[PDB]
Design a binder for this molecule. Structure first.
Ligand SMILES: CC(C)CN(C[C@@H](O)[C@H](Cc1ccccc1)NC(=O)O[C@H]1CO[C@H]2OCC[C@H]21)S(=O)(=O)c1ccc(N)cc1
Lengths: 99, 99
């Protein structure tokens, strides 16, 4: 799928049996979701962005099915206004920027 | 160009005769730059992101030469960790996400 940028690049994803919409974000190193539970042992970390830094929980090898592809990787959970698919997962679907 | 996401998608830009590197951020609605001088008036505004909000200056009709393409539009100036090229200018260079 080719995606233009006239609107927010939101895709439907399935993570841990839950349906969500997440932002394909080339400016995010990492993937972060709002509150939810996930398998495995998590380490507490802190991520930073435009407005400051937030405390989040980091999970490794989480499965996300994004628009029909499958990816496994670190998924961080914490207070974000959007669900964001950082580059860690974008690489795994072979997502590129073109112009 | 085609840009993979294994590394941060930075490009060199020329804005107001200054050479800068900026992020091709599909998660950003607008464009924000570090502290600098610019032409025209500016209304003070506030942008929100991961971790809160910041006060910034908003300029209109600002020209940027991105990787040899020219675009004009609203550029925000304020305390960001990265210069960010948002959708408000990515659409003008015809930039798309592909996978
Ligand atoms: C909150 C997002 C939906 C939108 N953001 C763009 C996003 O790409 C930022 C852009 C960004 C890039 C570097 C530093 C701060 C913000 N990246 C980000 O927050 O990512 C964090 C999680 O992954 C890590 O990667 C780096 C920061 C971490 S934003 O910075 O807050 C933003 C929102 C609106 C505008 N007009 C401009 C910028």
């Amino acid at each position: 799928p080719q995606i233009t940028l006239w609107k927010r690049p939101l895709v439907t994803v399935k993570i841990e049996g839950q349906l969500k919409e997440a932002l394909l974000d080339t400016g995010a190193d990492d993937t972060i979701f709002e509150e939810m539970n996930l398998p495995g042992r998590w380490k507490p970390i802190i991520i930073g962005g435009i407005g400051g830094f937030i405390k989040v929980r980091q999970y490794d090898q989480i499965l996300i099915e994004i628009c029909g592809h499958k990816v496994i990787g670190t998924v961080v959970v914490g207070p974000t206004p959007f669900n964001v698919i950082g580059r860690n997962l974008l690489t795994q679907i072979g997502c590129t920027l073109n112009f």
